[PDB]
Each structure stands twice: as C-alpha cells, then as structure tokens.
Amino acid sequence: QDWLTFQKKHITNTRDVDCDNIMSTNLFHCKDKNTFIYSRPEPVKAICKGIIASKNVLTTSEFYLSDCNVTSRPCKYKLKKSTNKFCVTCENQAPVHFVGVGSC
C-alpha cells in the first residue's frame, strides 16, 4: 500500500528467511505464500524511478528471491530460493505492492 509497508512485507536483509517465524506474525498471519527480495532498499526502490501513476512494472534485472511456501502443516513453510525478475506496482516512484515473480 506504500513503500514502508512494501519494505516490511517484501524486502529481506537475509536470504535465508526464517519463514516459520516471520510468516506467523500479524503482517503475514500464516498465509500460504510470500515472496521476499534479498536486497537493501534503494536498488529495489529504483525499479520505480520516474513512474508516477500506479503502474505494474517488471524488473529489468533479476534479483535474489526467497519464497516462503506453506507445507502440509499450517503455518510451517519450505523456503525456496531463486533468481528471477519480479513485478511490482510502482506508484510515485516507489514499489507499493508485490505482484508476482517472473511476469506482470
């Protein structure tokens, strides 16, 4: 919904996200999946430089992604690491929603 929330929801300072901890908090409330981007914030913010009206943008470069995928046990996850482009909703020069991996 805004850049601060996007950072909290989708940017990780570690590749090896502790999914069973973080996904259990209110922000994620044991949902089935969440994609995290392993980067400091500025190169992620830069994806949306110049984009004012809300628009979905596919990254030009690939990034390190860490995905928390639920297992057969509720709120327990398998972490999957991959390198891919991703699509975000850019608004007023910052990411404000994560859309998907690989494609808009």
| Rg calculated over all Cα atoms | 13 Å
- SSE class: alpha+beta
Query: What is the H-and-E element order?
Result: HEHEHEEEEE
Fraction of helical residues:
10-25%
Q: Major β-sheet, in short?
A: 4 strands, mixed
Beta strand count: 7
Number of domains: 1
CATH class: Alpha Beta
> Which architecture name does CATH use?
Roll
Q: CATH H level: which superfamily?
A: Ribonuclease A-like domain
Disulfide bonds: 19-68, 30-75, 48-90, 87-104
Protein name: Protein P-30
EC number: 3.1.27.-
Family: Belongs to the pancreatic ribonuclease family.
Summed up:
Helices cover 16% and strands 40% of the residues. The chain is α+β, with helices and mostly antiparallel strands.
Describe the overall structure.
With 104 residues, this protein is of the alpha+beta class. 16% of the residues lie in helices and 40% in strands. The chain has a single domain (2-104), classed as Ribonuclease A-like domain (P-30 Protein), CATH 3.10.130. It has three helices and seven strands. The strands form two sheets. Strands 1-2-4-5 form a four-stranded mixed β-sheet. It is globular, with a radius of gyration of 13 Å. Belongs to the pancreatic ribonuclease family. GO terms for molecular function: endonuclease activity; nucleic acid binding; RNA nuclease activity. Substrate binds at residues 31-35.
